[PDB]
Amino acid sequence: VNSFSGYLKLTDNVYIKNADIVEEAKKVKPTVVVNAANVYLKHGGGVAGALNKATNNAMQVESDDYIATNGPLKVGGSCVLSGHNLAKHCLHVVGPNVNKGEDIQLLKSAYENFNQHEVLLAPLLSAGIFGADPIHSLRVCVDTVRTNVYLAVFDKNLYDKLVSSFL
Numbered sequence: 001v002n003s004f005s006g007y008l009k010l011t012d013n014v015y016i017k018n019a020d021i022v023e024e025a026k027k028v029k030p031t032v033v034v035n036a037a038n039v040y041l042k043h044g045g046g047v048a049g050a051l052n053k054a055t056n057n058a059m060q061v062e063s064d065d066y067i068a069t070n071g072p073l074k075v076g077g078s079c080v081l082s083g084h085n086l087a088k089h090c091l092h093v094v095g096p097n098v099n100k101g102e103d104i105q106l107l108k109s110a111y112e113n114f115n116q117h118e119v120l121l122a123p124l125l126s127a128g129i130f131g132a133d134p135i136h137s138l139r140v141c142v143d144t145v146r147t148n149v150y151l152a153v154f155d156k157n158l159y160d161k162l163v164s165s166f167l
């Protein structure tokens with residue numbers, strides 16, 4: 001038994017809810033929240049801008065030190081950093097940016113990072129401002145992640161489409 005409430009169960013391990021991931025993380029304080037990161041950990045907008053704003057920019061300060069030491073992530077890659085006031089840890093995962101001509105096949109590699117964590121609160125990777133089809137992202141998630149993932153969909157019309165079209 002865990003603290004997540006109000007989710008629809010899609011599969012043995014994947015759950016979904018219409019929720020603001022920021023508000024969900026603040027309420028639940030999960031072990032792991034996933035950020036929709038870019039390779040530079042520049043948290044300007046979308047999920048990343050919203051998570052970073054909720055940390056009062058502490059996520060960005062920590063991220064800039066990480067990049068100064070390690071250089072950029074790979075597309076499809078991840079790093080574990082602090083969750084600040086939102087979670088114990090933040091798993092920063094880089095989904096492909098379709099708007100940058102970045103291979104959609106890298107979305108499966110991105111989701112494989114979730115398998116290193118038993119339970120996660122996450123957005124749909126490469127959705128929103130990363131330009132991928134969120135229906136596709138949900139399918140890759142279900143077919144790739146084996147650990148328990150609680151998906152936060154900000155768009156209610158999209159949430160309802162994802163549920164109503166789910167095979």
Ligand SMILES: O=C(O)CNC(=O)NC1CCCCC1
Pocket residue numbers: 123124127128134152153154155156158
């Ligand atoms: O709400 C979310 O969590 C992510 N939002 C989207 O992925 N929106 C797309 C919906 C379909 C058309 C393009 C934008």
